[PDB]
Nucleic acid binder design. Sequence first.
DNA 1: ATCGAGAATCCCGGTGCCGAGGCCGCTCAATTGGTCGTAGACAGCTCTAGCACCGCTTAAACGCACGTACGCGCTGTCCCCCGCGTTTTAACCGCCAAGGGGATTACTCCCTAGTCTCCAGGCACGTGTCAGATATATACATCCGAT
DNA 2: ATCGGATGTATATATCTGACACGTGCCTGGAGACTAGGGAGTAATCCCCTTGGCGGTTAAAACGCGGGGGACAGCGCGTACGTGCGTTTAAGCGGTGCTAGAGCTGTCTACGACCAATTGAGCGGCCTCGGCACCGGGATTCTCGAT
Lengths: 103, 103, 94, 94, 96, 96, 79, 79
Amino acid sequence: KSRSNRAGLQFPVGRIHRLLRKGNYAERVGAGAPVYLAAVMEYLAAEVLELAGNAARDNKKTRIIPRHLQLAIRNDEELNKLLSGVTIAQGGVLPNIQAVLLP
Amino acid sequence: KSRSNRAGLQFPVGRIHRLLRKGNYAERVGAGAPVYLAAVMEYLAAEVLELAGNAARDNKKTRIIPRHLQLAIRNDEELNKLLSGVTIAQGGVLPNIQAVLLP
Amino acid sequence: RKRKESYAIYIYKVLKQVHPDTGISSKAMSIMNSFVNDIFERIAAEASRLAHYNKRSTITSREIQTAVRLLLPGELAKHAVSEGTKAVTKYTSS
Amino acid sequence: RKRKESYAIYIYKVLKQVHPDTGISSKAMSIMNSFVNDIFERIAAEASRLAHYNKRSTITSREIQTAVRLLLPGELAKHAVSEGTKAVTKYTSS
Amino acid sequence: PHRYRPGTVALREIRRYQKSTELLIRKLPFQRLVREIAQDFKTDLRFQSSAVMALQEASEAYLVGLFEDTNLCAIHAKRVTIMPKDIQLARRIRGE
Amino acid sequence: PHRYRPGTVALREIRRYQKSTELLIRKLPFQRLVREIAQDFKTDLRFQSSAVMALQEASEAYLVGLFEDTNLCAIHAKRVTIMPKDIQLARRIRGE
Amino acid sequence: DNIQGITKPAIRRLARRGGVKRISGLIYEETRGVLKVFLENVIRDAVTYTEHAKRKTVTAMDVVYALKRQGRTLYGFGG
Amino acid sequence: DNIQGITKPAIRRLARRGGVKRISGLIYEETRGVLKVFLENVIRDAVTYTEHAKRKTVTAMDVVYALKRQGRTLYGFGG
DNA sequence: ATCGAGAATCCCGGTGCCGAGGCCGCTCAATTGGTCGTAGACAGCTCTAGCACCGCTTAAACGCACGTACGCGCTGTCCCCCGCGTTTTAACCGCCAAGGGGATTACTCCCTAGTCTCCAGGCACGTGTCAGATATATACATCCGAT
DNA sequence: ATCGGATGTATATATCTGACACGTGCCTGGAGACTAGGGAGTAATCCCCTTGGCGGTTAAAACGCGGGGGACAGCGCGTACGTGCGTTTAAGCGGTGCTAGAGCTGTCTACGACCAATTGAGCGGCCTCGGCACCGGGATTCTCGAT
């Protein structure tokens, strides 16, 4: 009987509960805290990968190549604020020509 | 016999060697590390307060009011890069009128 | 040998709940690896700095919950707060 | 009561080595208090993140020295590296 | 009679407000602003009076830190007058 | 004969370089740049070949992230051409 | 109510500190609209600290803790 | 030597990704002068990690550690 | 500037090759079950100190006339950069070693952690009087409109 | 340009008064020893992988030229905004008042650390088959001189 499937997640809880112990974030961690943190990590990775497939579907591919994460991250107002600093390796950029440069 | 005056500093070393132990930066700290860190904290505070007096001297005061730290920090290229993000409470700003706004 | 530590085969088993007829490439298994290690080592380094401000040496769930209303901007904080709370109330009752 | 923790009377005893005919005001004892707590809690939180990158649980002086060449830009890194090194070699010989 | 020219009093209230240290917005019509914003996230707060003079030292350190990088977007267009083209350019280059 | 107008090929190599993903600067005349900068801080280095294609994905993510906020300082001056007034304005507003 | 508390000349004398010469007649509304965005990204992150430690009083340390998080560290109150 | 390795059209086709229409004839030198500033604020902070762990080989993790420190976090190599 | 001309671009449909999907096998890390100390939950009681409120007052917001100076619009002016060609340079791909240095295990002993126990440095609570801001007349610095 | 009457700002002068600096006293946090273990240094070794060199092959940089559309400076002018006086406003300040909540202590008990054995979930290596890249000819998309 695992510990994640006691709470029904997919991210591991035993693997996190060594990293709040051997990174020295603090000395003592609660028993619910590596459960509660494996949920918020899930809900964000289940948020990008929902949006990752729609760029994979709109562009008619099957796998999610790194270009498709760039459209998925940078075309949502709620999540670009979370990642306004970071970049992505070989991500490309959005199609965005200015208004006045048109013929 | 203290520990700072074994090495001849002015910042305390016993007071730092609890803060590399009870902030959980890591678990084990060396015996020389709270000495070496009380030097670099001294050399910066002995760098601003050298420059703080010159603004106090050029403006003919005796105490160092918080205005004088603003001139001391922001008129040195080597130290403004260290503090390019931070501000100062009631610090004011430099006298800087642009070129084209003159009559 | 190099034994490992990755979140490869967990993220791959969240992709198979939202688009179960797609797949993921190799380098996106490297991006999504480094994406959740960002969100882990930004939230856990915030409740650490939050328990230190009140002179307290326990990272409970109540300090993670306050450290999610300060990193997720809006419309994710209104969900992921009420997402772990479901995931903790399905844990003490088992 | 509130017992305290400040760096008031140490910074005041560095001002009396560089301008021994001046004094310091009240709020500058609050700025310089919060200035050295910045430089302390930025350097110590860097050698912490540096010892973690090499799988090592000791903050020696060699990790503080590498974490001063990355926070002080230039012409302070060429001094404060060779300022603590004088202050450690005056410590093992006593 | 006597009357200056437009371009004179501006150059004697830049050189006066770049030497003083005190507040520029008021105290009590800013304290009424902070409470009215904070009656939304949690009702019935109670601020310490060293924390309403802490915001007032930060937002003044945010607008002064904005016009100094707004006016470089006005002089760049060969003009000496800021305008809401310039504010909106100052925040779409810096992080919005 | 046949010849386009100036203003056409620009609008068909923006719409082509905003869809591809690959590198834009070269590989080997950038690898020779990184080693010549690094023969100053410590002599005789040896780079991993996943770390010369790591800088090359970062500096391209720094210049593309610069022209997109440089060109807003050109259109703001009622012109469509960047110029070193515009680069130097893009870095004195953002942290230099 | 109080967004018109910060009047016309108090926005004016802020901008004179920034080194501007002639303010247009439209910045006096735009500044009010870009300041109230800034206070809703501080007080929203300063109640959350005060709500955390079970206090009904937003002290001065929590504001400095809020301004520290978004790269606008403030000296002269504690740290 | 190699600052003229990044030629004229390779600076040109970078800027076409940024959405510019007509580059002047002076950006081709100014970009070389503002890129070599950026590599001397990364490689200077990437040798220092490699010199720290007693290695003579700047690996890919240390560069990502260098770019992380100054707010330009890079994905897709480790973290 | 509407129709035509043509260069380029969006899908058709076959080809094929090589990296994701997938069990298989090994093995270090999680889960189970007691024990221990102890941090935090809870309560209680002092007491700072923040909110309401007056009331006299005086700097400051608010409104209105107004002349001038910059905003924005136009027009010609002219070259600097786009574009298409023809050429030269060299990046790239593949080949093919020789060894530097990364990665790991292997023994060990110095270094910090922890417990112990007294003190002396640092802070709280007084307080004396020193720099500073005060005012006030006067003088030095800078314009603005007539000469 | 140069002179003139403001107009302001800067230089020097008594007088407080509320604010730093320093004496006076404690008490809890550092210091000095003493020990045990466990990390990190140090020694030493397979092989991964970078460095380097070269041939061939071609995509791409380089240089050169015609012209056309924009950057840049100027005339102009219409309205937008500053300067100033006077006129309502409400900031501020001292001052007394009310109790709400920060701020701190003891009093028990539940909570995670720690260890220790036990076994699966996780990964390393391992072929292998569907998804992605082409590779040529249809079909369109779309700017550009003209009758």
